[PDB]
């Protein structure tokens, strides 16, 4: 059932944008995550460069406010090379 | 900042107790996207460290259906905090 990733980070690659023949807009960028996480009582650095895709009309708008350096939080499902398919985007 | 993955799947690689247990989780689901249903698939390496989750771990065998929660890190692996 469950497949949900919430990941904050800094955009390290600006949105590449395109539209399919059928008229579906797609936007792809990369989210660089860095943080300290707790695991079994010890602090450890977590790092990931996560490709993000925003598909469909409904979330394209906010995307135009995202550039390299933008701090955001993306919520969505992962699909595998791994990509995070954005369902929600929060501008930090 | 936020780093939280909740993933359900089937164990495709039997847990090897290395102090941490490591295995691979195969996920397959149908997800909704841009008006359409799109299948999603991943084979996620999972690491469970913490004696709290070591009883459940050693029951798990390939084919077991579990739900895991934790943070992701790229060496990509899921460092599991909880596992049902």
Q: Which of B50, B41, B42, B49 is nearest to B22 (CA)?
A: B49
**Which positions in chain B touch A4 (Cβ < 8 Å)?**
5-7
Which two three-digit tokens encode residue B28?
Answer: 């397959």
Q: Are A50 and A73 in contact (CB under 8 A)?
A: no
Q: What CATH architecture does domain A2-92 belong to? A: Beta Barrel (2.40)
A 10 A CB-CB count for A33 gives 22
Cβ–Cβ gap B5/A1 under 8 Å: no
A 10 A CB-CB count for B75 gives 8
Q: How far is CA A64 from the centre of its chain?
A: 14
Q: Is A63 helix (H, G, I), strand (E, B) or coil?
A: helix
Which two three-digit tokens encode residue A44?
Answer: 């450890």
Q: Are A28 and A14 in contact (CB under 8 A)?
A: no
What technique solved it? X-ray
**Which positions in chain B touch A77 (Cβ < 8 Å)?**
29, 31, 40
Three-class SS of A12-40: EEEEEEEECCCCCEEEEEEEEEEEEEEEC
Can you name the residues that pair with B31 across neighbouring β-strands?
Answer: B38
Map out the domains of chain B as residue ranges. Answer: 2-84
Resolution (A): 2.0
Running DSSP on this structure, what letter comes out for residue A56? S
Which two three-digit tokens encode residue B22?
Answer: 């490591």
Cβ–Cβ gap A80/B43 under 8 Å: yes
Question: What is the rounded distance in angstroms from the CA atom of residue B5 to the CA atom of residue B79?
Answer: 9
Q: Check if B2 contacts A (Cβ < 8 Å).
A: yes
Cα B29 to Cα A2, A3, B26, B32, B57, distances in angstroms: 8, 8, 10, 10, 23
Nearest CA in chain A to B34: A56
Please report which residue ranges of A14-65 form alpha helices under DSSP H.
Answer: 60-63
Give residue A56's region: left, alpha or beta (phi > 0; psi -120 to 50).
left
Chain pair A-B, CB pairs under 8 angstroms:
95
Question: What is the rounded distance in angstroms from the CA atom of residue A62 to the CA atom of residue A65?
Answer: 6
Question: What is the rounded distance in angstroms from the CA atom of residue B65 to the CA atom of residue B81?
Answer: 17
**Which positions in chain B touch A39 (Cβ < 8 Å)?**
49-50, 71, 79, 81
Q: How far is CA A51 from the centre of its chain?
A: 6
Strands A42-55 and A83-91: parallel
Three-class SS of chain B: CCEEEEEEEEEEEEEEECCEEEEEEEEEEEEEECCEEEEEEEEEEEEEECHHHCCCCCCCCCCCEEEEEEEEECCCEEEEEEEC
CATH class of the domain at B2-84:
mainly beta
Can you name the residues that pair with A43 across neighbouring β-strands?
Answer: A38
């Amino acid at each position: 059932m469950t497949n949900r990733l919430v990941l904050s980070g800094t955009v390290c690659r600006a949105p590449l944008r395109k539209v399919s023949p059928s008229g579906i807009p797609h936007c792809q960028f990369v989210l660089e995550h860095r943080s300290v996480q707790e695991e079994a009582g010890f602090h450890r650095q977590a790092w990931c460069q996560m490709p993000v895709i925003v598909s469909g009309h409904e979330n394209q708008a906010i995307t135009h406010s995202i550039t390299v350096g933008s701090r955001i939080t993306v919520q969505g499902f992962i699909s595998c090379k791994m990509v995070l398919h954005a369902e929600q985007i929060e501008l930090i």
